């Protein structure tokens, strides 16, 4: 069985260097034609190919990222490393490393080359965020007027943050939206709940453990 | 570089359906093409390699065909685990291009979004910032457009969106859009508008308020 796993820092500040490590097992980078590639995925976006390195130390990079990437391998400790110099928030993404099969070899020979046409095994992936920002608790604001309603959980860092309504009793009609990383390097998120304009009190239970920021927020029209 | 356009971007389907996704290259990529399925939270999983070769372990309901510039992925009988996003990858040229992806969600009846506009709290305004939030609740399909207008001026570059994951019970999506201005700026206008365009709406619905009007 083949496995790959990404390791590195979850946070990096702009202008800094990001060093990602891909530790694998089940194959060697001394094995014929084998390659290990890196692919990232910004939150909510498509896959973007970054680079690949093969057992013969052959290297290829993304043309648009070339000046900032360096890929390398340590055959002895099954590790492929990716160095990304001077990052910006756009570099924020999930980074995957993946295995690429080499050609099928029969005794001496390569009878088959179709298996190289894919990255057959991927690692879980590592999430990296780029912010010059420091740990910070959110400011909770009310969102007031079937009727809608909610809390604006704003300017916190880093992820994540928990949002509950009425200490967990209210769950139906709730929508806690995924957070957006603001140009400020802080996250902002909203949790809303729809109900029968007839009604019952509504309170947001907001908790951002990193900052130890805990907030209860009653919301009325 | 080389262009990998997927069709369609989003696809509505139900269990048991036969679906096909296509990946189109700007230049021939021979048979050097791979298809992957990605479930939220997980990494892409190889389904097809070399345009048609079925990867070991992958269910026979997955099938790939085509060569050159036209490639198709076929899932003969959709199972629950196929509600995911699919990607194609080209490995004939460097860089090894990936397509934009094809989201496959649970099909349901069309449902227009309940729109709601929230003005900024005075509590926030005191801090020097004004966030206007627009909410598009339980709609379908997942494809919606939100256009902010301030005193009829079109807003651009000052809003961020966020969509929920299809509801496991509703099969609907919900969208949050936040228009952010400075307090000074916010107080220089009166009509804050959220225009919503969506398939379940004959024409765009607009929700607004007049800053002030008490």
């Amino acid at each position: 069985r083949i496995t790959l796993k990404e390791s590195g820092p979850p946070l990096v500040k702009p202008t800094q260097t990001l060093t990602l490590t891909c530790s694998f097992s089940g194959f060697s980078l001394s094995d014929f034609g084998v390659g290990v590639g890196w692919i990232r995925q910004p939150p909510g976006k498509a896959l973007e190919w970054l680079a690949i390195i093969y057992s013969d130390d052959d290297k290829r990079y993304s043309p648009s990222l070339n000046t900032r990437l360096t890929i390398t391998k340590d055959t002895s400790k099954n590790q492929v490393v990716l160095v990304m110099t001077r990052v910006s928030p756009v570099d924020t993404a999930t980074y995957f490393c993946a295995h690429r099969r080499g050609p099928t070899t029969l005794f001496g020979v390569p009878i088959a080359r179709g298996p190289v046409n894919a990255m057959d095994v991927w690692g879980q992936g590592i999430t990296v965020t780029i912010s010059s920002t420091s740990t910070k608790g959110p400011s909770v604001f009310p969102l007031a007027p079937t009727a809608a309603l909610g809390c604006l959980v704003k300017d916190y860092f880093p992820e994540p943050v928990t949002v509950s309504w009425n200490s967990g009793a209210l769950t139906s009609g709730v929508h806690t939206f995924p957070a957006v990383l603001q140009s400020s390097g802080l996250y902002s998120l909203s949790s809303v709940v729809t109900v029968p304009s007839s009604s019952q009190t509504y309170t947001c239970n907001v908790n951002h453990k990193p900052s130890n920021t805990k907030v209860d927020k009653r919301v009325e029209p | 570089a080389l262009q990998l356009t997927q069709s369609p971007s989003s696809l509505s389907a139900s269990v048991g359906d036969r679906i096909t996704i296509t990946c189109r290259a700007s230049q021939g990529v021979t048979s050097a093409l791979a298809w992957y399925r990605q479930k939220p939270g997980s990494p892409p999983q190889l389904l097809i390699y070399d345009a048609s070769s079925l990867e070991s372990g992958v269910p026979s309901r997955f099938s790939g065909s085509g060569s050159g510039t036209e490639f198709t992925l076929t899932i003969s009988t959709l199972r629950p685990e196929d509600f995911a996003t699919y990607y194609c990858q080209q490995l004939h040229f460097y860089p090894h291009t990936f397509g934009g992806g094809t989201r496959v969600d649970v099909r349901r009846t069309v449902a227009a979004p309940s729109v709601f506009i929230f003005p900024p709290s005075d509590e926030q305004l005191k801090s020097g910032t004004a966030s206007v939030v627009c909410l598009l609740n339980n709609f379908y399909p997942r494809e919606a457009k939100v256009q902010w207008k301030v005193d009829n001026a079109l807003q651009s570059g000052n809003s961020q969106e966020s969509v929920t994951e299809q509801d496991s019970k509703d099969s609907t999506y919900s969208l949050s859009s936040t228009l952010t201005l400075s307090k000074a700026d916010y107080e220089k206008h009166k009509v804050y508008e959220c225009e919503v365009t969506h398939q379940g709406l004959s024409s765009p619905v607009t929700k607004s308020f007049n800053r002030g009007e008490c």
Binding site: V116 | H92, F93
Partner: peptide
């Protein structure tokens, strides 16, 4: 540029 294989 062409792929390795």
């Amino acid at each position: 540029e062409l792929d390795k294989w």
